[PDB]
Write a protein that binds this ligand. Structure first.
Ligand SMILES: CC(C)=CC(=O)NCc1cc(-c2nn(CCCN3CCOCC3)c3c2CN(C(=O)CC2CCN(C(=O)OC(C)(C)C)CC2)CC3)ccc1C(F)(F)F
Length: 220
């Protein structure tokens, strides 16, 4: 039986919240965020991986369009194919499309595989968050209430299951009888609760949080 509440920040597995700015790279930030947690678990080191590396390099071949959108799964596929991803320190985020300047000399992580979860199964997402670590998910963030969110458990009656914003589910919980998903965003500290939003859990795949989940792994 799973833990009632999970918060991977308490295990030192989550990097600082990032700020994507006018570049639509949330897919890239969700992908590194998931891989940072696996890297921490394996090596004991928490390091920001280069979202910019994904923006500039995981491009046409992976169905991604850099600052105009992308997918976490094919981002993971690029890191597998590329046999590494640079540290964010060595490949900083500039919030625009650049030439791919990946440099294996500054490889901070690798990716062995990635696993996708079934559409809509919040129970399965719960299990994956408890047993594997933070999970990359899309959410429907095209709502003013989302941008304007400050605290508490978010619920948007007009939310759809059609995701359009990549985020990181770093845990789950319960606040005053309202179940939520603990979601790491890429809009800086001033969005929501220190850059995090707690979104309704077990409310029929609210905002599509469980539409398209996936997490990577770094194998021995
Ligand atoms: C480049 C761009 C701009 C990308 C983008 O958008 N990224 C957002 C996003 C998409 C998906 C996602 N992954 N996958 C599966 C992988 C597909 N491939 C990826 C690359 O190659 C390998 C496989 C789907 C979706 C979105 N998706 C839906 O939501 C379902 C549809 C329901 C209703 N619609 C419909 O009927 O569409 C018609 C009308 C026919 C056009 C529209 C949407 C369709 C299927 C998952 C996560 C994210 C997020 F980044 F946010 F995290």
């Amino acid at each position: 039986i799973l833990p009632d509440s999970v918060d991977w920040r308490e295990k030192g597995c989550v990097t600082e919240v990032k700020y994507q700015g006018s570049c639509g790279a949330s897919w890239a930030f969700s992908a590194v965020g998931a891989l940072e947690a696996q890297l921490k678990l394996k090596t004991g080191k928490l390091v920001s991986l280069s979202a910019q590396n994904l923006v500039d390099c995981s491009t046409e071949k992976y169905g991604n369009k850099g600052c105009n959108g992308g997918f976490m799964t094919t981002a993971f596929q690029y890191i597998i194919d590329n046999k590494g991803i640079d540290s964010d320190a060595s490949y900083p985020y500039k919030a625009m499309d650049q030439k791919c300047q990946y440099d294996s000399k500054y490889r901070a992580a690798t990716c062995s595989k990635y696993t996708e979860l079934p559409y809509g199964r919040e129970d399965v997402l719960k299990e994956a968050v408890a047993n594997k670590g933070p999970v990359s998910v899309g959410v429907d963030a095209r709502h003013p209430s989302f941008f304007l969110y400050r605290s508490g458990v978010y619920y948007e009656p007009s939310c759809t299951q059609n995701v359009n914003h990549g985020v990181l589910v770093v845990g789950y919980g319960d606040l005053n009888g309202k179940e939520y998903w603990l979601v790491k965003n890429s809009w800086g500290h001033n969005f929501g609760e220190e850059g995090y939003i707690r979104m309704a859990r077990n409310k029929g795949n609210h905002c599509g949080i469980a539409s398209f989940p996936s997490y990577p792994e770094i194998l021995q």
